[PDB]
Design a protein around this ligand. Structure first.
Ligand SMILES: [Mg+2]
Lengths: 54, 47, 48, 224, 49, 39, 34
């Protein structure tokens, strides 16, 4: 009946395991927008760009 | 040999390779792992 | 103080980055670089 | 050739698709004899000789390259009004003496690209090569030399074109259809190991790597 | 006789625009299925991603 | 422990706890076998 | 140095021939630094 591995208990998982799916979904979400983001960058220009990360 | 070679003589070059039997690949990659689990699951969205 | 070291962050949200130097009195850097996590060339933008 | 200044145009095509000079073509595309689109700029009729030579055949036995003829034909009458010449029809339709039919170009795996040099030579007036003498030149010749083939029959190279060929996904099957040997052979780059003989490691930490200085392994082991 | 040639000119263009739109339709359909597919592979510790 | 249980709970190792698994269940105590299809 | 000491001792660059004529070499061997 110990924490996690006992009868009825459920393992919690490490932080990098609980956030694994949300981690890969964020990278997938970004690549899908990569083409449209490069077009805006190659169109607006390297100098007039202002949408920088934070 | 004496350099420079005459401009009209064939290039002198060495093979620089060793002969080995070619490796023919086998298409036998299983779909289920040793633990009886699928090695990959495919999902498709719907619009 | 005339030069600063900036960090160009991958817009693929992989966490990879490049570091380059550029004067303070210059516009932020933005380049198309190779990301070894996704193994493709993506857009990199300055951190701040 | 020691020197070569072409004096006629030669454009070769494979299955209707014109190939650029010096292009790497798939083994499946080059399995059939090409079609030459020639053009001479001097008057009169003459007899041409076409030779396709592979210049980069690897000979691992002697660690050098050898030459190999993939097509040979002589006594091809040509005039400045003629345009197209299909090498398939050099015996039946077009007048000529084929000394060697078309051999599909191929390249074993690991070797660099092979150059298939297409030469068009001009025979002197009233100099018709004998059909047998042409086929005997290839009887016991494994390293074809255009230099020797030219002076023997007194030819003059006038036209030229080129295309390359390397190992591709179709190279294996192409050798099977035509029964070409060597497909079960791969070439790996020769390695030249260091010529320096082994020595004894030098340094404070390198001398003390043995169990003798076990009390000092806190300074000699797991060094970044 | 010039109207016929112009109709042939318009027909060849309108025909291409039709076959060009049909090809663009299939491409957008194949890009939609590729970008929507999701292959979850067994990486380590019995995890899929 | 989590690791020790997962080790003897999978049939790849012929673990003596593998009989506790279902034919479609995973040995991991946290991860699960995802489902394939259009949904 | 001089009235004001000025330590001036550079590391030797060792330029020139590293291989002489008819000497055997393999790929990557330096033959001449200049
Ligand atoms: Mg000083």
């Amino acid at each position: 009946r110990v924490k996690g591995t006992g009868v009825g208990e459920k393992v919690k998982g490490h932080k990098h395991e609980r956030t694994l799916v949300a981690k890969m979904e964020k990278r997938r979400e970004a690549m899908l927008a990569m083409p449209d983001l490069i077009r805006e960058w190659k169109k607006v220009g390297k100098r007039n760009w202002t949408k920088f990360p934070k | 040999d004496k350099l420079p070679y005459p401009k009209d003589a064939p290039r002198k070059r060495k093979l620089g390779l060793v002969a080995v039997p070619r490796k023919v690949e086998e298409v036998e990659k299983p779909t289920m792992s040793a633990s009886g689990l699928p090695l990959f699951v495919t999902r498709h969205e719907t619009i | 103080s005339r030069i600063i070291n900036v960090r160009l962050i991958s817009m693929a949200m992989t966490g990879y980055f490049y570091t380059f130097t550029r004067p303070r009195t210059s516009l932020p850097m933005s380049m198309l670089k190779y990301d070894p996590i996704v193994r493709r060339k993506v857009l990199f933008l300055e951190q701040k | 050739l020691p020197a070569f200044d072409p004096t006629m145009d030669v454009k070769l095509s494979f299955r209707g698709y014109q190939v650029s000079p010096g292009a790497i073509l798939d083994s499946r595309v080059t399995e059939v004899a090409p079609t030459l689109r020639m053009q001479v700029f001097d008057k009169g009729e003459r007899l041409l000789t076409v030779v396709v030579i592979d210049s980069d055949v690897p000979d691992v036995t002697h660690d050098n390259f050898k030459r190999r003829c993939h097509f040979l034909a002589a006594n091809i009458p040509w005039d400045p009004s003629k345009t197209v010449l299909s090498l398939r029809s050099v015996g039946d339709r077009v007048e000529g003496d084929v000394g060697k039919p078309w051999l599909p170009p191929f390249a074993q795996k690991g070797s660099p690209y092979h150059r298939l040099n297409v030469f068009v030579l001009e025979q002197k007036p009233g100099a018709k090569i004998d059909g047998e003498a042409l086929k005997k030149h290839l009887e016991n010749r494994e390293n074809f030399s255009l230099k020797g083939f030219r002076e023997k029959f007194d030819l003059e190279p006038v036209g030229f074109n080129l295309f390359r060929s390397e190992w591709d996904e179709g190279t294996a099957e192409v050798m099977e259809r035509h029964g070409i040997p060597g497909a079960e052979v791969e070439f790996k780059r020769q390695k030249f190991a260091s010529l320096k003989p082994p020595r004894k490691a030098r340094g404070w930490e390198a001398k003390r790597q043995k169990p003798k200085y076990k009390s000092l392994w806190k300074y000699v082991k797991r060094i970044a | 006789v010039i109207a016929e040639l112009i109709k042939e000119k318009l027909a060849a263009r309108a025909e291409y625009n039709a076959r060009q739109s049909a090809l663009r339709k299939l491409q957008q359909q194949k890009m939609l299925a590729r970008r929507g597919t999701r292959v979850l592979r067994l990486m380590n510790n019995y995890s899929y991603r | 422990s989590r690791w020790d249980i997962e080790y003897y709970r999978d049939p790849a190792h012929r673990g003596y706890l593998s009989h506790q698994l279902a034919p479609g269940e995973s040995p991991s105590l946290y991860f699960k076998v995802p489902t394939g299809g259009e949904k | 140095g001089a009235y004001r000491l000025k330590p001036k001792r550079t590391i030797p660059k060792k330029l020139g021939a590293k291989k002489t004529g008819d000497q055997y070499v393999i790929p990557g061997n330096i033959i001449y630094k200049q």
